[PDB]
């Protein structure tokens, strides 16, 4: 009922023209946005609503059955052209929002779709100029959240000196929020999976994020960060927190983020002997991009040791998880697109089935298709006591639509906190400093393969049984 | 390869002509019997193989495709007419077995299909004359195994003075052998269901045996025994033992039967305040037998307080099952045919879902439609943390064919032992003595109903949460 | 070194002249204070160091051997006479503080020994004038912390608007700091008491605080608060938190206080059916104060329903403590002085000792005669398997000296936090408002007795097995 | 009443004159034997009561105060001189037994104190002639119980063909029966030690039997057997069974020996890579026997590889003990005399005390100075969270007197069964056969030392944390 404003900062960027404008399209088309919602794209280059429409519609997946809606949404939008570090431009933007139907009373939601190098200014000029004194103000901030503990600490200190945690929404583009809630209901609403979610029963946890494509085109941007900062420090660590957290006092966002930050506090810094770093190389037998390696892109500087694959073993050192490995295995240009949580359970204490039993597994897959199944063992039909392994299933805006919708709803559970991000960077900072100090060479692996075999050796070493 | 002889004692009885002869039919037709297996019916009335064939074919459920095979089976059988308590008849029977291809070397398997009041004689004669000096000798003993602890004790003492436990096969017609193996593999090969199979997680165990029909025709025979001796003292108690047993040292029959008797040794005698007894009356509404009550059967003595339904709460007083109710609910002329094991689990400690979660259940239904499924809370598809109860499935000669096969293969695991039967009668003897001494009146319940509501009240009292 | 100042706000009060001045005297005498420490009393009435000495020496409990040291102590003291709500007086106090050896560089430690109704002013003035720009500033705040959730929230919001949690030290005079550390090392450094510290094994927790004396003289001050605010809302609740808290991420003060507030968050509001309130009356027989009841004290208003005894059952509704009662039993004019934690464990699952076993107990007695002992079953010497109950022991400035030392050392673990106090008041606020709205009459109990019998009945009802 | 006869078979042997006659002395003197108990020595050499008295009194340890009672005892005894394999002598012994006050009605208790090579004869004759038709008959059998599985099976089959298990009492001279009851009451009457008694908490179990002396003169008798048959196959294995057994259905002897044999059934055969064997050699620095080695004894055959020390790691492959080492360390000529059960517990999951905690231990020392104590971490008195290890104590005819009393009382709990002995020999037979086939050389260790260092290395390898 309350009027809302959606201010897309840096609306001329690729992220705005390809992923955010289509997302608010899909939210308004499905009737999920509040009825009184305005979309104010603000950027430097001078554009109009017609220009935004022309440059963004290809990604709208538009259909002729709903072109009428394609007008209404675009009658709800507006554009402001101004520099990111000019107070007059932000004054014009604030006046423009005020020059709307109940714009002063509206709840303002700033989606920062602009390079992080100018977050410091953009988050600053917002506070004095474009804030709302009646409705709430919320900023959505995109990664990179710095690159070290120090850089992230200074950026977070700036944003927290200006805004509060109730106004900061650090977004994770790879968080399903549907398999996350599936995890929470599975392990917290059920006594089947309650007592077994600890050291005594779980042997290892595997947290996977594989991509079948390399770093085509935008390989230079990936070079300065690496796969640990790109996927592992932020996403896989949040998945680890969700897997390993204790039951919160309630389903409140703060009560869940407290458990997650506690899990992060129980994790120590990463040692280089628990890390396998790999880099993908061209595949002579490939067809398309598979024949070109990471260093074959003309945008990647020569002799770059940036890892496109990482397998890292972590240990949550508390009463529930002491000694249980957490293998974060992420990679680009791998064989498949996969993102899942895998728990092997220990072998049953005392085998009366003649070593025919395999470790039970609980798999919560998020990509490509969501699923929740258990690999247990059932009696093989026949005349005999010989068990056989069976996979038993235990289980629609996509992940990104439901994440922008959380910022509207104020559900800040699935966004990383400031102390949470601080612990996340504390865990990985010494290892990253060592990596870009000594400059070790990552293991080369073929495009489309499963990654370096040293990763498999490391998982086997830490206690992972593969059939 | 070894030659076998199958001696059907009392082959003229209804049990042999309707259940045993068709079963050896289906075992030979399916190629499951050993190739050199002879069938020797033995009874009082002068009959021939042709007479047995005439009395047996309607229940054989044969087809024209295998009628030639029929001849083979009926070229394989033989008949002996002799009194059950005459040594000359048993000498003739032993000579007749000796007058077969390798009859002296054959393994002899006696199925005692004759009234229990004659057992004490027949077994004696079997030991005197018809035993085999080369191959093994095995007797299949049919229930009733006495009426109480004293009668069962004397019968078992006689049979054990003659034969050993390796030769005694006390058969349970209602035991699946298929879903029992599912139980054992599920709870002993899987770590998912291992740690949760105890006091801490399981709230109650419900062992059910319902029949939708009454005691038509043969109601007088049921009158002298009652539903406790009919279904509960023998079958449901074995199901209880299988559910509650510790993991055996191996899958050997003796190692499993030791756990069964150990479970029985820690069940106290049944108290009448944990027992609800009912008797079915006619559903006037109508149907067929539904309109005839238990006492409306002319063969049932007038003023009979025999219970056709019983709900009994037991407690396995040991480290794993202290305080966990075991509700044996058995009944005739109930609403449905059902035989299942139901484990409710405790409510999750700490409910963050606003009392929306329901107790998890593990259901192992043996008949009809064998199934193994868990009712647990899954995330309701949508937008919020809403748990909803969902039923997730975790899962061929019939039970009787696979039980006669056990005596051939020597798998004695699914047959009750002498000490196991002694404990089974020890548990129920005081209650049965009280019932047939005081003669309480069972609660009348409508034919086709769910039984007396006092059973539901008793389960609610002992800790059964019904939704 | 790092010169310190100890500012006793309200040094003319009874608390300063009887408990605070002797405590800092014993801390300086024992060589526990930092060498460069000044004690600056500040009050309204015009006094001097000689007057403070005259009013303080009888409570100093000094000896002629160390009298010279006493002189040294009084060489480090000074006095300032100024009103509590006068900015000029605080300017003079700050100037006097600066007029010391490195007074500007000194770490200032304010002990607020003045009535709570003045706190709102004093803290303000302390923030305006008497802050230190170089060293740290710490305030020690005495109870009462308000009368309910609203008053405590007001005072806490004021103090937190001025000071931060690193500067607020809310003192608990009844907390040992000695047996708390024994409790933490017992349940966190030992695997003997780790796994058993939960629902599965612990039947109930009893937290006791008894005083053998009544409310002599100062009965009017106790009238406006009651035993729930006096001892139960603040002290016994912190003992509950220490008993029930999860293992912290470290021994840091914040990591422990986080677990304590997490335990508080999962305790529901108190219901009047879980509360037994009592008032002590004259033990006629008596001898001294025992002959005078609570209402016989002339300063107590007539017809006062203030409870001098309370037995309250709480439930920590989380995974570790769901369903386990926590009986806080506190009282004045009871039979003995006692303050202990008592855990009964559950009965052993499966009794092979013919019901001769009693529930195991773990007792952590804080005063008098600090002890840790388990009551378990040991084999009675002789020829037989008959266990007998045996008490086995598992186990220096007093508590108050070690608490003032914490504020110097910065160990803020044993002081209540703002959110901790908020949850503590949230638990008890509805019950207290109901008590002072309906005005129920507490059960009268004899001076020197064990309390009302309804408390024993309530413990027996909730699951306390007293042998 | 129920007059008793105590038949010492082989009363002229050293075991009778040094251990048995003094034991029945101490049993009769203490008023522990039944009043009408007769002692009948039976041997080959022609002796009288006076000769037995002369060879017995020096070991009786008598005092002048009770010398009168002495004649009573020697007025109670009798002697029969007859060959061990002569039916006429046994008929004479039976007639002499009948030639006593109510000798025919007496309960006969035969203590076989004669070389094992004669057992097969003696028992036979005992069954033919000397049995009692009215009272019970009980034979006490002494180790060796064969040399391996085959010999023990032969002897046990013979004795079980003659006697039943209710009549066989296989004696263990090293079993306390006082600290065994302490074990059972400790771990079965207490919830403190119940849940923690498993894989999740116990790291290793150490069962020790050290002797400070070596084979003095009877090294020839020890040579044919070795320390595995002498102390480990029989005594330490029973200690293992008592430590590892599940809770019996009752304190009945059969219910306890069932759990013991069930524990034995889930122990695999011993592998030579889990065995360290040692032989003691003379110590130049010794004074008495310490300077003579095992091979320095003229009775020991030259080049004897008999192990006087053994450290063997076993694994009870069941639900409660899978993967938990059971280190049986036994030895002769070691540093001290000791026999204890030691349980180390696992390190606490999550150390908040900076690697200062040591593994908790539960020690049940049987000799010398019987004790039960736990080593756990207690808070070191002071100002600090640093724990220190502390030893907390949790705790009369000698063991042999209480064992002969058990045979009188019919308590067969602490004697090894036929199937128990069969499993015990099954575990150790392959290893002993390998030892006698390959003839490995044991590690030489100094007399009075702690044993070979390879034993310490083996324990460290299997998971024993020594501080």
- Concatenate the DSSP letters of all residues of C109-154 into one string: EEEE-S-HHHHHHHHHHHHHTS--SSS-EEEEEPSP--SSHHHHHH
φ, ψ of residue A436 to 5 degrees: the values are -85, 15
* Contact present, B168 and B145 (Cβ < 8 Å): no
The residues near B440 (Cβ < 8 Å, ≥ 6 apart) are B272, B277, B305
Q: Which among B349, B358, B464, A188 has a CA at the least distance from the CA of C323?
A: B349
Contacts of B394 in chain A (CB under 8 A): 376, 378, 390, 392
CB contact under 8 A, D248 and C352: yes
Chain B nearest-CA distance from C347, in A, is 10
* Residue A84 · residue A114 · CB < 8 Å: yes
The answer on whether D154 is annotated among ligand-binding residues is no
Identify the experimental approach. Answer: cryo-EM
Q: Which of C346, C383, C385 sits opposite D191 (nearest CB)?
A: C346
Q: Which residue of D has its CA nearest to A323?
A: D349
**D414 counts as catalytic:** no
Residue B45: count other Cβ atoms within 10 Å of its Cβ.
Answer: 8
Inter-chain residue contact D350 with A317, CB threshold 8 Å: yes
Q: Are the C-beta atoms of residues B171 and B403 closer than 8 Å to each other?
A: yes
Q: Distance (Å, rounded) from C-alpha C372 to C-alpha C393?
A: 6
Whole-number Å distance between alpha carbons of C366 and A202 = 39
Q: Between A249, A262, A266, which is nearest C266 by CB?
A: A249
Nearest to C260 by CA among A249, D357, A261, D356: A249
Chain D neighbors of C191, CB-CB under 8 A: 196, 201, 345-348, 359-360
Shortest alpha-carbon distance between residue C246 and chain B (Å): 14
Is the omega angle on the peptide bond into residue B144 within 30 degrees of 0, that is, cis? Answer: yes
- For C268, the closest chain B residue by CA position comes to B350
D440 phi, psi to nearest 5 deg: -70, 155
The answer to whether the CB of A248 falls within 8 A of the CB of B352 is yes
| Inter-residue contact B297 to B250 (CB < 8 Å) | no
Query: Chain C residues with CB inside 8 Å of B359's CB?
Result: none
Instruction: For residues C172 and C414, give the distance between their C-alpha atoms in angstroms, rounded to a whole number.
Output: 8
Resolution in A: 2.8
Q: What superfamily does domain C179-398+418-462 belong to in CATH?
A: Dihydrodipicolinate Reductase; domain 2 (3.30.360.10)
Place of tokens 């602009």: A114
How far apart, in whole angstroms, are the C-alpha atoms of residue A436 and residue A151? 15
Smallest CA-to-CA distance from D414 within D277, D275, D235 is with: D235
Cα separation of A91 and A102, whole Å? 18
CA gap A256, C344 in Å, rounded: 32
**Which tokens go with A390?**
């069976």
- Contacting chains of B (3 CB pairs or more, <8 Å) are A, C, D
* Subunit contact C246:A194, Cβ cutoff 8 A: no
Contact D1, D36 (CB under 8 A): yes
H or E element that contains D207: strand D202-210
User: Fold for domain D179-395+417-462?
Assistant: Dihydrodipicolinate Reductase; domain 2 (3.30.360)
Pairing of strands A202-210, A387-393: unpaired
Whether the CB-CB separation of B2 and B34 falls below 8 Å is answered with yes
Helix, strand counts (H, E) of chain A: 15, 15
The helix (H) or strand (E) run that includes residue B119 is helix B116-125
What does the radius of gyration of chain A's CA atoms come to, in whole angstroms?
24
Residues of C with CB under 8 A from a CB of B: 199-200, 266, 317-323, 348-351
Q: What is the DSSP letter of A65?
A: G
- For chain C, the chains sharing at least 3 beta-carbon pairs closer than 8 angstroms are A, B, D
CA D111 to chain CA centroid, Å, is 16
Tokens, residue A313: 């073993």
- What's the count of helices (H) and strands (E) in chain D, helices before strands? 15, 15
d(CA A278, CA A442): 4
Sign of CA dihedral A151, A155, A160, A164: negative
Chain-centre distance for alpha carbon B357: 36
Nearest CA in chain D to A315: D350
Which residues have a C–N gap over 2.5 Å right after them in chain C?
Answer: 395
Contact status, residue D364 vs residue D178, Cβ threshold 8 Å: no
From residue C422, alpha-carbon distances to A102, B136, C412, D201 in Å are 38, 80, 17, 38
C232 class by beta-carbon count within 10 Å (0-12 exposed, 13-18 middle, 19+ buried): buried
Contact D181 C385 (CB under 8 A): yes
- Cβ atoms of A228 and A431 within 8 Å: the answer is yes
Contacts of D61 (CB under 8 A, 6+ apart): D22
Alpha-carbon torsion, ordered D353, D355, D356, D359, to 10 deg: 110
Residues of chain B with C-beta less than 8 angstroms from the C-beta of D246 = 246, 319
What angle is formed at CA B368 by the lines to CA B365 and CA B372, rounded to 5 degrees? Answer: 25
Neighbours of A92 (CB within 10 A): 17
Q: If we measure between CA atoms, which residue out of B462, D317, D116, B387 comes closest to residue A355?
A: D317
CB contact under 8 A, B350 and C200: no
Instruction: Give the chain B residue nearest A201 (alpha carbons).
Output: B191
Cα separation, C234 vs C262, in Å, equals 16
CB < 8 Å to C255, chain A: 265
Has C247 been labeled as part of a binding site? Answer: no
Question: Is C318 in contact with A247 (Cβ distance < 8 A)?
Answer: yes
Are the Cβ atoms of D349 and A199 closer than 8 angstroms? yes
Distances (CA, A) of D147 to B114, C144, D226, D428, D433: 51, 80, 10, 10, 10
CATH class of B4-142: alpha beta
Q: Which residue of B has its CA nearest to A351?
A: B189
Secondary structure class of B387 (helix, strand, coil): strand
A4-142 shares its CATH topology with A178-462: no
- Radius of gyration over alpha carbons of chain C, in Å? 24
DSSP type of residue A267: B
Write out the catalytic residue numbers of B. 235
Which residues in chain B touch residue C323, judged by CB atoms under 8 angstroms apart?
349
Q: Shortest CA distance to D357 belongs to which of A265, C374, C188, C193?
A: C188
With residue A14 as reference, give the H or E element that holds it: helix A14-15
Residues with Cβ within 8 Å of B341's Cβ and at least 6 positions away in sequence, in order, are B183, B205, B206, B207, B208, B239, B243, B362, B363, B364, B365, B366
Report CB contact under 8 Å: C396, D385: no
Query: Which residues of chain C are at the A interface, by a Cβ-Cβ cutoff of 8 Å?
Result: 194, 246-247, 249, 255, 258, 262, 265-266, 318-319
* Shortest Cα–Cα distance, B256 to chain D (Å): 12
Chain D residues in contact with B247 (beta carbon < 8 A): 318-319
**Which ranges of A137-236 would DSSP assign to H, the alpha helix?**
149-162, 178-188, 219-223, 226-227
Nearest CA in chain D to B249: D266
Strands A275-281 and A443-446: parallel
- C56 touches C17 (CB < 8 A): yes
CA distance C317 to chain A (A): 9
Q: Do A387 and B349 touch (CB under 8 A)?
A: no
The alpha-carbon gap from C173 to the nearest alpha carbon of chain A, in Å, equals 30
Answer yes or no: are the C-beta atoms of C146 and C153 closer than 8 Å: yes
Those residues with Cβ within 8 angstroms of residue C215's Cβ, 6 or more apart along the chain or in another chain: C222, C294, C297, C300, C308, C332, C333
Q: Of D276, D223, D227, D215, give the one whose Cα is nearest residue D452.
A: D276
Q: How far is CA A172 from CA A177, A231, A348, D66, in A?
A: 10, 10, 38, 92
B318 and D258 within 8 Å at the Cβ level: the answer is no
- CATH for the stretch B179-398+419-462: 3.30.360.10
B378 and A186 within 8 Å at the Cβ level: the answer is yes
Active site residues of A: 235
C175 is known to lie in a ligand binding site: yes
How far apart CA A440 and CA A452 sit, in angstroms, is: 15
In total, the C-beta contacts within 8 angstroms joining chain B to chain D are: 22
| Listed residue (B315, B367, B327) closest to B210, CA to CA | B367
Instruction: Quickly list DSSP for C2-63.
Output: --EEEEEETTTSHHIIIIIHHHHHHHHHTT-S-SSEEEEEEESS---HHHHHHHHHHHH---
- D partners (3+ CB pairs within 8 A) are A, B, C
Partner-chain residue, chosen from B195, B249, B250, that has the shortest CB–CB distance to A195: B195
Q: Which of D383, D396, D406 to substitute to test the interface with C, most C CBs within 10 Å? A: D383
Contact (CB<8Å) B319/C266:
no
Angle, helices D399-409/D21-29, rounded to nearest 10 degrees: 80
State the maximum Cα–Cα separation within chain D, in Å, rounded to a whole number: 83
Alpha helices in B285-415 (DSSP H): 399-409
CA distance to A426, B66, C138, C252, C413, per residue, from C255 (Å): 17, 79, 20, 5, 9
Q: Which helix (H) or strand (E) holds D431?
A: helix D418-438
| Set of chain A residues whose Cβ sits within 8 Å of the Cβ of B185 | 353, 377-379, 385, 387
| CATH no. of A178-462 | 3.30.360.10
Cβ-based interface (< 8 Å): residues of D facing A:
199-200, 266, 317-320, 322-323, 348-351
Domain ranges of chain C: 4-142, 179-398+418-462
Q: Report the gap between the CA of C421 and the closest CA in chain B (Å).
A: 23
DSSP letter, residue D282:
-
* Torsion sign (Cα): A267, A271, A273, A279: positive
Alpha carbon distances (Å) from A348 to A380, A386, C226: 18, 15, 56
**How close does chain B come to A462, measured CA to CA in Å?**
20
Q: Whole-angstrom Cα distance, residue A353 to residue A438?
A: 51
CB pairs under 8 A between A and C: 22
Partner residue facing A322 (CB), from D318, D322, D350? D350
Enumerate the H helices of A30-66 as residue ranges. 49-56
D315 close to D325: Cβ distance less than 8 angstroms: yes
- Structure-block tokens of residue B294: 């238990």
For residues C157 and B117, give the distance between their C-alpha atoms in angstroms, rounded to a whole number: 89
Contact A249 C255 (CB under 8 A): no
> How far apart (Å, rounded) are the C-alpha atoms in residues D370 and C378?
14
B403 is in an annotated binding site: no
């Amino acid at each position: 009922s309350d009027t809302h404003i959606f201010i897309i900062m840096g609306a001329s960027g690729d992220l705005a023209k390809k992923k955010i404008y289509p997302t608010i399209w899909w939210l308004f088309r499905d009737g999920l946005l509040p009825e009184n919602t305005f979309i104010v794209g603000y950027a430097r280059s001078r554009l109009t609503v017609a220009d935004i429409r022309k440059q963004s519609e290809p990604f709208f997946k538009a259909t002729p059955e709903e072109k009428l809606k394609l007008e209404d949404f675009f009658a709800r939008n507006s554009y402001v052209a101004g520099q990111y570090d000019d107070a007059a431009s932000y004054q014009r933007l604030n006046s423009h929002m005020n020059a709307l139907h109940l714009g002063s009373q509206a709840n303002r939601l700033f989606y920062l779709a602009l390079p992080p190098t100018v977050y410091e200014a953009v988050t600053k000029n917002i506070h004095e100029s474009c804030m709302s004194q009646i409705g709430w103000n919320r900023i959505i901030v995109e990664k990179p959240f710095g690159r070290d503990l120090q850089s992230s600490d200074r950026l977070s200190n700036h944003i927290s000196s200006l805004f509060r945690e109730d106004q900061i929404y650090r977004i994770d583009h790879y968080l399903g929020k549907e398999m996350v809630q599936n995890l929470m209901v599975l392990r917290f609403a059920n006594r089947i999976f309650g007592p077994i979610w600890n050291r005594d029963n779980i042997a290892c946890v595997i947290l996977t994020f594989k991509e079948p494509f390399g770093t085509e085109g935008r390989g230079g941007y990936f070079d300065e960060f690496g796969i640990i900062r790109d996927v592992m420090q932020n996403h896989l660590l949040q998945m680890l927190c969700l897997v390993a957290m204790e039951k919160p006092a309630s389903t409140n966002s703060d009560d869940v983020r407290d458990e997650k930050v506690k899990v992060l506090k129980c994790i120590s810094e990463v040692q280089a002997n628990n890390v396998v770093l790999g880099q993908y190389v061209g595949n002579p037998d490939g067809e398309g991009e598979a024949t070109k390696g990471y260093l074959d892109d003309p945008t990647v500087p020569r002799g770059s040791t940036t890892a496109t694959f990482a397998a890292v073993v972590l240990y949550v050192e508390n009463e529930r998880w002491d000694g249980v490995p957490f293998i974060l295995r992420c990679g680009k240009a791998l064989n498949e697109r996969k993102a899942e949580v895998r728990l092997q359970f220990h072998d049953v204490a005392g085998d009366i089935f003649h070593q025919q039993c395999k470790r039970n597994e609980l798999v919560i897959r998020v990509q490509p298709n969501e699923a929740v199944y258990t690999k247990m063992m059932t009696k093989k039909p026949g005349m005999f006591f010989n068990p056989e392994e069976s996979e038993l299933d235990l289980t629609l805006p996509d992940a990104y639509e439901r994440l922008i919708l959380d910022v509207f709803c104020g559900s800040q559970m699935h966004f990383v906190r400031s102390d949470e991000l601080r612990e996340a960077w504390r865990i990985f900072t010494p290892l990253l400093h060592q990596i870009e100090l000594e400059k070790p060479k990552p293991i080369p692996y073929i495009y489309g393969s499963r990654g370096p075999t040293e990763a498999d050796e490391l998982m086997k070493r830490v206690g992972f049984q593969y059939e």
